[PDB]
Structure 1
Amino acid sequence: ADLGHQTLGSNDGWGAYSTGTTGGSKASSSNVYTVSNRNQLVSALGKETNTTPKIIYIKGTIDMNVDDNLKPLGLNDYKDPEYDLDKYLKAYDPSTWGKKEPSGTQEEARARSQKNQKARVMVDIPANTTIVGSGTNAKVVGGNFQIKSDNVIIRNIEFQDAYDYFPQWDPTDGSSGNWNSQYDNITINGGTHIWIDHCTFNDGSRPDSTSPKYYGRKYQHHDGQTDASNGANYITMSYNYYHDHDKSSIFGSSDSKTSDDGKLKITLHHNRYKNIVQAAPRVRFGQVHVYNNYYEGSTSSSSYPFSYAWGIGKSSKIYAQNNVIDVPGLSAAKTISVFSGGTALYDSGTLLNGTQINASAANGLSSSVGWTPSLHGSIDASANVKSNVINQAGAGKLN
C-alpha cells in the first residue's frame, strides 16, 4: 500500500495497542482528498463529526497564516486595535511592574490578538484520518495541528515555524521570567491511537536567533514541536527529524494533572534531534518507550545550545534503550534533567560521545520504572543508531 493507505504495524509501539492505529486506511473513494492550500485542507478535515475514514494527501507548501482568499497574514492583520508592543513592554517592565502577573489593558489586548491568529493557524484533526505528504516537498508552514480524536496517522510532512506573533510575558516563569508562546506543530490534546512518522519539525526561516531579547529574555515566538497532554494515550512517533528548535516534546503538561497517571503511553523511536535545546522528551507520569533515537548538538551553540535530552518529570516512567547522544563535553549526568517528583529511569545501551553510560545511575535514580515494553519492532545496536537515523529520519525520505 502507499503512504496514504498504510497502517501502523501491529507491533510498532504504543500506537498499536488495542484497536491500533489505522487512520483513514479504510476510506471510501469520496473521502480521499488532495490539498495544496489552507482552504482545501480545512475543507477536507471538516468538523469533529467528520469521522468517516479519510485520507488527505498534501501537495506542496501549505501556509496556514492566510485569509480565506489565501492572502498572507502577519502581525498587523492579527493585532487587536488596542495592542501595541511598545506599550506592552512599557506596561510590564519588571523595573516598574515588578513580578506580578501582567494584567490590564495591554495584556487583555495581547490575549485577544493571540486568539485572532489561533483562528487561522490551529486546526483540529478528526477521528480516523490519515494525512500524508505527497512527494518529498510537502510542507505545513505556521500551522498547529491538534488531535483530540482517536485513530490518526500523520506522515511525510515538513512542519515549519509554528509562530506566535504575540508571546506572553511571565515574570515568575523561572528566576528571571520568560516569554511563552502557544503554537506547537502538533498538539495531542487527549488524542489516542496516533502515529507520527517520517515528519520533519523545525523553526523554518525564523529561528530563535532572529528574535530579540526583552527584559533580558528571548522574545520566544515558538512553543513545542510534538506535545501531548490531557490523557493523550497510545502514540507512536517514529523516524521524525526534529531540528533547530528550543522546546521539542513535552508529554504531560502539569504536575497537578494526576489523571495523566496510567496514560501518556508513547513510543519514540528512530527520531533525530539536531540542535534541539531541551525536552526530547520531557515526561510527566507516562510509560514512555524511547529507543534508537539520535541526539546531536552543542552546549556552546549560538542559536540552539543543548541543555538536556530526557526530562525526568513528576512520576515519569521512561524506558530508554540504545539511544545515542553526541554533545561534546557533556557529562553522563547532564544528558538528562531531573525535576521534582522524578525518581526513576530505565536506560540501557545509552551511548554518549561514543562511550557507554548509565544516565539513570549517574543521577541517583531508581532503575525500576515498573514496566517493560512489549510493542516494539527490531532494536538496533547502539553502534548503528547514528547512521540509521541520519539516513532514514524525516520528511522526503520515502515519498
Structure 2
Amino acid sequence: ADLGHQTLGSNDGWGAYSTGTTGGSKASSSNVYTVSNRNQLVSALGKETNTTPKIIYIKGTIDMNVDDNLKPLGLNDYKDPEYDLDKYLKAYDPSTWGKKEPSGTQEEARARSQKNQKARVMVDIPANTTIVGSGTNAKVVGGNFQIKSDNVIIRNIEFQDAYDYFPQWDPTAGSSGNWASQYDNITINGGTHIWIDHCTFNDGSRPDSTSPKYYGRKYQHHDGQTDASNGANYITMSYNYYHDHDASSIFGSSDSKTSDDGKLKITLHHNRYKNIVQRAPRVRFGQVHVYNNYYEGSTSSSSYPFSYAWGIGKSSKIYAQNNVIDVPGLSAAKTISVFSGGTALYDSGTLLNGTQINASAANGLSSSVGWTPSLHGSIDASANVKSNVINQAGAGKLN
C-alpha cells in the first residue's frame, strides 16, 4: 500500500493498542484529496463532524500564514489596532512593572492579535484521517496541526517554523521570566490512536538566533514540536527528524493534571534529535517507551545548545532502551533533567559519546518504572542506532 493507505503495524508502539491506528486507510473514493494550499487543506479537513475515513495528500509547500486568497500575512496584518510592540515592551518592563503578570491595555491587545493569527495557522484534524506528504518535498510552513480526535496518521511531511508574531512576556516563568509563544507543529490535545512517522520538524528560515532579547530574555516565537496534553493516549512517533529548535516534546502539560495518570502512553522510536535544546521528551505521568532514538548536539553551540534529552517530570514512567546520545563533554547525569515528583527511570543500553552509561542510576532514580512495553518492533543494538536513524529518520526518506 502507499503511505496514504498504510496503517500502523499491529505491534508498532502504543499507537497499536486496542483499536489501533488505521487513520483514513479505508477512505472511499470521494474522501481522498490532494491539497497544495491552505484553502484546499482546510476544505479537505472540514469540521469535527467529518469522521468518515479520509486520506489527504500534501503536494509541495503549504504556507498557513495566508488569507482566503492565499495572500501572505505577517505581523501588521494580524496586529490589533491597539497593540504596539514598543508600548508593550514599555508597559511590562520589569524595571517599572515589576514581576506581576502583564495586564491592561497592551496585554489585552496582544492577546487579541495572537487570536487573529491562531485563526489562520491552527487547524484541527478530525477522526479517521491520514495526512501524508507526496514525494520528498511536502511542507507545512507556519501551521500547528491540533489533534483532539481518535485515529490519525501524519507522515512524510516537513513541518517548519510554527511562528507566533506575538510572544507574551511572563516575568514569573523561570528564575528570570521568559517570553512564551503558542504554536507547536503538532499539538495532541486529548487525541488518541495517533501515528506520527517520517516527518521533519524544524524552525524553517527563522531560527531562534534571528530573534532579539528583550529584558535580557530571548523573544521566543516558537513553542513545541510534537506536544501531548489532556489525556492524550496511545501514540507512536517513529522515524521523525527534529532539528534546530529549542523545546521538542512535552507530554503532560501540568503537575496538577493528575487525570493524565494512566494516560500519555506514547512510544518514541528511531527519531533523530539534532541541535534540540531540551524536552526530548519531558514527561509527566505517562508510560513512555523511548527506544533506538539518536540525539546529537553541543553544549557550547551559539544557536541551539544542548541542555538535556529526557525530562523526568512528576510521576513519569519513561522506559528507555538502546538510545544513543552524542554531546561532547556531557556527563552521564546531565543527559537528563529531573523535576519535582520525578523519581523513576528504566534505562538500558544507553550510549553517551560511544560509552555505555546509566543516567537513571547516576541521578539516584529508581531503576524500574512498573511496566514493560509489549508493543514494539525489532530492537536495534545500540551500536547501530546512530547509523540507522541518520539514514532513515525524517521526511523525504521514503516517498
TM-score bin (small chain): over 0.9
- Cα deviation 1:307-343 (Å, max 9, x = unaligned): 0000000000000000000000000000000000000
CA shift, 1:210, in A, is: 0.1
**In 2: Cα distance, 1:374 partner to 1:255 partner:** 27
Structure 2: how far apart are the matches of 1:242 and 1:46?
Answer: 29
Query: Alpha-carbon deviations, 1:244-285, whole Å to 9, x = none?
Result: 000000000000000000000000000000000000000000
* Equivalent-residue separation in structure 2 for 1:307 and 1:24 (angstroms): 38
User: Cα deviations across residues 61-102 of structure 1 (Å, max 9, x unaligned)?
Assistant: 000000000000000000000000000000000000000000
State the aligned residue count. 399
TM-score between the two structures when normalised by the length of structure 2 = 1.00
2-side partners of 1:32 and 1:398: how far apart?
A: 21
Residues 156-197 of structure 1 deviation map (CA, whole Å, 9 limit, x = unaligned): 000000000000000000111000000000000000000000
Task: Determine helix, strand or coil for the equivalent of 1:276.
Answer: strand
- The CA distance in 1 between the partners of 2:85 and 2:345, in whole Å, is 43
TM superposition score normalised by structure 1: 1.00
C-alpha separation in 1, matches of 2:28 and 2:253: 37
SS of the residue corresponding to residue 152 of structure 1 reads: strand
Report SS of the residue matched to 1:376.
coil
SS in 2 for 1:320: strand
Q: Gaps spanning 5+ residues in structure 2: where?
A: none
Matches within 5 A, 1:45-194: 45-194=45-194
Q: Secondary structure at the match of 2:118?
A: helix
Partners in 2 of 1:264 and 1:175 — Cα distance? 28
Cα distance in 2 for residues equivalent to 1:47 and 1:78: 24
Where 2:317 maps in the other structure, the secondary structure is: coil
Q: After TM superposition, which residue ranges in structure 1, 4 or more long, deviate above 3 angstroms?
A: none
Distance 1:144 1:385 in 2: 30
**What secondary structure sits across from 1:154 in the alignment?**
strand
Secondary structure (helix, strand or coil) at the match of 2:209 reads helix
Give how far 1:42 is off. 0.1
Question: Which residue of structure 2 aligns with residue 283 of structure 1?
Answer: 283
**How much has 1:104 moved relative to structure 2?**
0.2
Whole-angstrom distance in 2 between the partners of 1:72 and 1:296:
35
SS in 2 for 1:193: strand
Given the alignment of the two structures, is residue 351 of structure 1 paired with residue 324 of structure 2, yes or no?
A: no
Cα distance between partner residues in 2 of 1:236 and 1:339: 25
Give the secondary structure class of the aligned counterpart of 1:179: strand
- In structure 1, distance between residues paired with 2:156 and 2:349: 29
Aligned 1:249-398 pairs, distance under 5 A: 249-398=249-398
CA distance in 2, matches of 1:359, 1:127: 39
Distance in 1, Cα, partners of 2:264 & 2:152? 16
Map 1:216-235 onto structure 2 (within 5 A).
216-235=216-235
Instruction: Write the distance in 2 (CA, Å) between the matches of 1:236 and 1:347.
Output: 19
Q: CA-to-partner distance for each residue in 1:195-219, whole Å, 9 max, x for gaps?
A: 0000000000000000000000000
**Percent of matched pairs sharing the same residue:** 99
1:211-240 deviation digits (Å, cap 9, x = unpaired): 000000000000000000000000000000
**Cα distance in 2 for residues equivalent to 1:366 and 1:62:** 46
SS at match of 1:153: strand
> What's the offset of the Cα at 1:368?
1.3
- Distance in 2 (alpha carbons) for counterparts of 1:52 and 1:174: 44
- Cα distance in 2 for partners of 1:3, 1:368 equals 37
CA distance in 2, matches of 1:311, 1:180: 19
Deviations 1:27-75 (A, max 9, x none): 0000000000000000000000000000000000000000000000000
Other structure's SS at 1:318 match: strand
Task: Tell me how far 1:109 sits from its aligned partner.
Answer: 0.3
Q: Whole-Å Cα distance in 2 between the matches of residues 76 and 254 of structure 1?
A: 34
